[PDB]
């Protein structure tokens, strides 16, 4: 019980697929490109998490600030509650 | 990334292999076995 009686389908990873083969290219766009672009501009992802890092409280504050007005009612309510919860937690209340 | 133990079976067998010759449920139920095995050791 709790352990599979057969082997899982063998894992076949293509190490030389286009994505892996070109990983890291242009990470030096600034150093080698007259600093016209900064490497952080390459980053794809949430508008509020591009070239920026923080703890969960800081992320929630940042997300509400940048996209809070565009959030769905229930999501925004959860975010507001989370920030208040995290504010007490991170400040040792 | 969610991580779950997948080899718990082998962890339990390490205790149980020392309890086979015990009497009663001590010889197969891990929670009972472990305590008796610890006393044996």
């Amino acid at each position: 019980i709790g352990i599979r009686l057969t082997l899982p389908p063998p894992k076949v990873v293509d190490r030389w697929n286009e994505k892996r083969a070109m990983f890291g290219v242009y990470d030096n766009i600034g150093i080698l490109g007259n600093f016209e672009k900064h490497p952080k501009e390459l980053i794809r992802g949430p508008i509020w998490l591009r070239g920026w890092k923080g703890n969960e409280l800081q992320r929630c504050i940042r997300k509400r600030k940048m996209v809070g007005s565009r959030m769905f009612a229930d999501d925004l309510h959860n975010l507001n509650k989370r920030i208040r919860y995290l504010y007490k937690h991170f400040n040792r209340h | 990334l969610r991580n779950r133990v997948t080899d718990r079976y082998f962890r339990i067998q390490e205790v149980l292999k020392h309890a086979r010759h015990f009497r009663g449920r001590k010889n197969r139920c891990y929670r009972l076995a472990v305590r008796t095995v610890i006393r044996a050791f």
């Binding site: 352990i3 599979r4 082997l7 899982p8 | -």
Partner: peptide, 26 residues
């Protein structure tokens, strides 16, 4: 179904030992 390979492979070797003991080859 738990993702992973090492535990399943180890248990396969365990089962093979029993398959040998249950039917000891000639």
């Amino acid at each position: 179904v738990k993702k992973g390979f090492r535990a399943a492979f180890r248990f396969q070797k365990e089962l093979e030992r029993q398959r040998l003991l249950r039917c000891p080859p000639p």
